[PDB]
Amino acid sequence: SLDSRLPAFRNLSPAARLDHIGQLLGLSHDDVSLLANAGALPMDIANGMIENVIGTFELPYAVASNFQINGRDVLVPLVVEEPSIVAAASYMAKLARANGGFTTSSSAPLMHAQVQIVGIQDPLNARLSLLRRKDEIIELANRKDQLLNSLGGGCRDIEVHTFADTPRGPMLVAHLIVDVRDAMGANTVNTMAEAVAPLMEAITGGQVRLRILSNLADLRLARAQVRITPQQLETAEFSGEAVIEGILDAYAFAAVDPYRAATHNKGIMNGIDPLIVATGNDWRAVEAGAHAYACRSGHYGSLTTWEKDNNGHLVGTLEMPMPVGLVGGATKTHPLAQLSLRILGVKTAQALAEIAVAVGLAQNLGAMRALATEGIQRGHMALHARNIAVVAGARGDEVDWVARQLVEYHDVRADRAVALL
Amino acid sequence: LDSRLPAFRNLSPAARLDHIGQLLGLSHDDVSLLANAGALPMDIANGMIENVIGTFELPYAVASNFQINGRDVLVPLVVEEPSIVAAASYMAKLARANGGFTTSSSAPLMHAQVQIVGIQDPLNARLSLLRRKDEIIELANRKDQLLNSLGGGCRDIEVHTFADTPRGPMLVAHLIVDVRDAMGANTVNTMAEAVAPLMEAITGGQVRLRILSNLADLRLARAQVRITPQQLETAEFSGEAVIEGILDAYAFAAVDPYRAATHNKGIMNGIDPLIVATGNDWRAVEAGAHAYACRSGHYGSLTTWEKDNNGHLVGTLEMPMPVGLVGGATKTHPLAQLSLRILGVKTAQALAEIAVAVGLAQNLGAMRALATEGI
Ligand SMILES: CC(C)(COP(=O)(O)OP(=O)(O)OC[C@H]1O[C@@H](n2cnc3c(N)ncnc32)[C@H](O)[C@@H]1OP(=O)(O)O)[C@@H](O)C(=O)NCCC(=O)NCCS[C@@H](O)C[C@@](C)(O)CC(=O)O
């Protein structure tokens, strides 16, 4: 069984870290070659992915340590540009280990396919006409994709919503509820929506406009739970019971003030989005479903919950839409995306979804723990000290050195870093 | 500069590089940053984030035809999904015929929250804190003599109160800070941590969070576009019919969050790649975008689409856009500095105005294609 603790991983060299990861996972020489050498994404593949390609763009590729999900250790690849993200997530995962790690689950990979109908003077009546013939509609959609049905997916249901008074007149919107298995679902549900559109026009007598997937995938939920004891959060300056209370103060702040909830949820996506990028998935789709879900109640609030249990332990949850894919798009064509999937060892898209929410939950806890105690700057600015040196006017050889002087004076500021003069 | 770039799509990436270099007078140093893979050295990438074991590549593209306030610009984009660069370049082409994209922006102002709990008289303490704002503003600014010399710094204080939370009433002070050419997160977090003790001394509570807000509604960027019906006539539909179909798609997104989420996702399909190419924090931009889209309590569309008195299609995009030319990873990543040289931006707000123009163009391309698709 795998062991993800990785002692002293933080201070190894990039090549030494890569060698250590290679031995743990049994990666081939070609696998480690893809990360030890630039240009893993070939120009012919890149030119065929998006338009007007003139090259490639690199971001650091990292691994978060200590993660244990449903009793099994996991290494998590992350691709991002911001410091302290990987460190905080590894820290919080380390704390979660002592109490069993993370406990996750997920729903079926259900996606919405919208079919918008206009030009109807009786949208409410047309909705009942569609619901009456729903089996005839579901069958038509499922006969368009026999492979997905053989894989255990397909259209499961239809639901119809009406907007009888819009500025452009009455509107009817039918939702196909489609199990997309291991795909993100975009092209699967868009094709079904195109297939059922003429039948819907005949049933309702209106004009179908949009046939498009919805990114508010509130039926594709992934969940994560975590428990932290007061003893794990004790510092030389704060008691662990006080840290837990401060974290609860920060959670209620996010629940009532959207100015905080936006930043609170941003910290969650600081952990989720790099995993999305590392696996070649669409991070815009994940961000849209996350933040829109955060306002489903009519008030933009926190995606996570934080509570104290009857034992005084800090318990946290994260439940959110998580539409990710193992097949389709850049997940299969980017060789480093396929390597990330092998590093994770995930065998279904839902398994990858559960890892993502576990990381996001850990990320949010890391920001809150720092914010409630010493502040965010002490630990974050220390890992940011190289960039502050480049900003103050050094950057040549005067960098990688005056960063130390900032850290040792516990004063990573541009006003201080310019003490080069 | 002429950003039209004919015969660019079917060309080769080298000839594309050859072009872009010729149009801007790029150094052979700059051209080699993109000709040879590995513009980010390990020594640099190892000091950017933690636990670095490699680098991860995404295509680096340039959208054509864009024109902002009369000035032609080339827009670098970094993303994995197709059709984004093409739809943006073809919408920016139609915008050229009517003057291009027209943009404006507010001052680069960011919030810094200081949360204070345990105050028994938070409403009274709010006025006591506001009356001594000049001390708080001064103290915050003496922590960044550099920003103040460049014309920035903490400008104002606002105080909000929440008398009804399960953890008691809270007083939340907002530092209003001009961050000039930086995105501003670390900058205002330092200021927030610096003024918290004085705030506690005045209010008598206990300070908890000292952190910026990503809902940066004081750092708005605005974009405008105009399209005439003759530009939109297809094979089966008239240009007037296409405009009406685009308006139907907009009202759809305006009433249904399930559509608005996808509608706004298309907007960030154009913005986020520019954020990446310039080495900026795309999580902060995404959070500010979507939280702003539901400021009314109803999650709606960030863009607007109307038919003016001439029958022309007119679109807008106003949204928070905290970006930087300096700070974070912008000054550190070599290709990020190259992206800024390709763009020619001199301020962070100028980068912001370009971002919203690309998002507006991306949203138009998505709606034009969806509205014209036949049954
Ligand atoms: C982690 C810190 C940055 C510094 O750690 P420390 O000094 O305090 O304790 P330590 O004993 O030394 O390190 C303990 C453990 O941390 C890991 N570890 C430690 N250093 C490591 C390293 N260099 N490499 C690898 N692993 C490392 C490593 O696993 C280690 O275990 P080990 O014993 O070695 O086996 C912490 O201050 C911490 O989490 N800060 C929180 C920072 C944070 O959230 N950033 C998020 C981005 S901002 C913003 O976008 C988000 C937001 C705030 O706006 C959201 C919101 O508003 O909500």
Ligand SMILES: NC(=O)c1ccc[n+]([C@@H]2O[C@H](COP(=O)([O-])OP(=O)(O)OC[C@H]3O[C@@H](n4cnc5c(N)ncnc54)[C@H](O)[C@@H]3O)[C@@H](O)[C@H]2O)c1
């Ligand atoms: N939730 C969030 O959005 C969040 C939270 C915490 C940290 N961060 C991270 O903070 C970083 C952004 O912080 P930052 O923008 O302050 O960068 P920075 O901290 O790297 O640099 C800020 C300093 O640059 C100096 N400066 C010099 N010339 C300047 C000029 N013309 N204009 C403006 N500043 C100038 C200033 O003195 C300023 O203090 C990002 O990496 C971001 O990911 C983000």
Ligand SMILES: C[C@@](O)(CCO)CC(=O)[O-]
């Ligand atoms: C086309 C679109 O779905 C982009 C796909 O990534 C956006 C939209 O529906 O408006």
